[PDB]
Amino acid sequence: MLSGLNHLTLAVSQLAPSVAFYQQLLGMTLHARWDSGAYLSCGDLWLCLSLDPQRRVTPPEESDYTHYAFSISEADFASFAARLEAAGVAVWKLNRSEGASHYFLDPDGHKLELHVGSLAQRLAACREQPYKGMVFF
């Protein structure tokens, strides 16, 4: 039986700029780097960057809604989002609201998000302002 996420692996087109993005800009911990990959952590998350010549830099209008959200506290959210905008990080748009979030792209067009709040808080907010057709189990 499954117990959670073991690791997230992102395919990247150029290793050095991607390591710089996740380590220098987002502040993840770099544990190891080799000619074709890197291992980073963010709290409990094991992130692997894997050099892949198949990876294409895709505009957000032509990629689907698959995306990866990172937790940040209420106190740090705005100042962290402001730092990303000042660094010229591009944005993308989701079709629906899901609370306090900032949506941004990595150098290869992976869709990232900063989000404040847990699943439990999201469900409680949705009880008051449900999505269309929502049912709770």
Place this chain on the structure above:
Amino acid sequence: MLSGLNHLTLAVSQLAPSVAFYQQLLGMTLHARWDSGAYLSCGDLWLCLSLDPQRRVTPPEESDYTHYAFSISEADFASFAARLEAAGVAVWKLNRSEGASHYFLDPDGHKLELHVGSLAQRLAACREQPYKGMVFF
């Protein structure tokens, strides 16, 4: 600062087969569903399925190496892999590393993995037998 992964959102082409896969086949807990999505949990992982008309059922040869690995114990690994094989789930890669991994596809072609072992265990193995160009920090 970022404190971990908040949620993983997968774009899906049809909600019902994706809920069946993640809830019934993989055993994740379904918390809520609406006209265009669902929220599930797997241990401490919050998973969102988002219905997206942009999502193509993508063959594994046409997508890059980006993938999502779930944690499982060694004791449960072989029986879980056998369950996936009985259900007809396609495999996209053979395991060619030491640790136990099973590489399988979801109904829309998202690349998934079952993996036994932590980052610390991988780093220890790599310290003994480093990859080409490997530097530790």
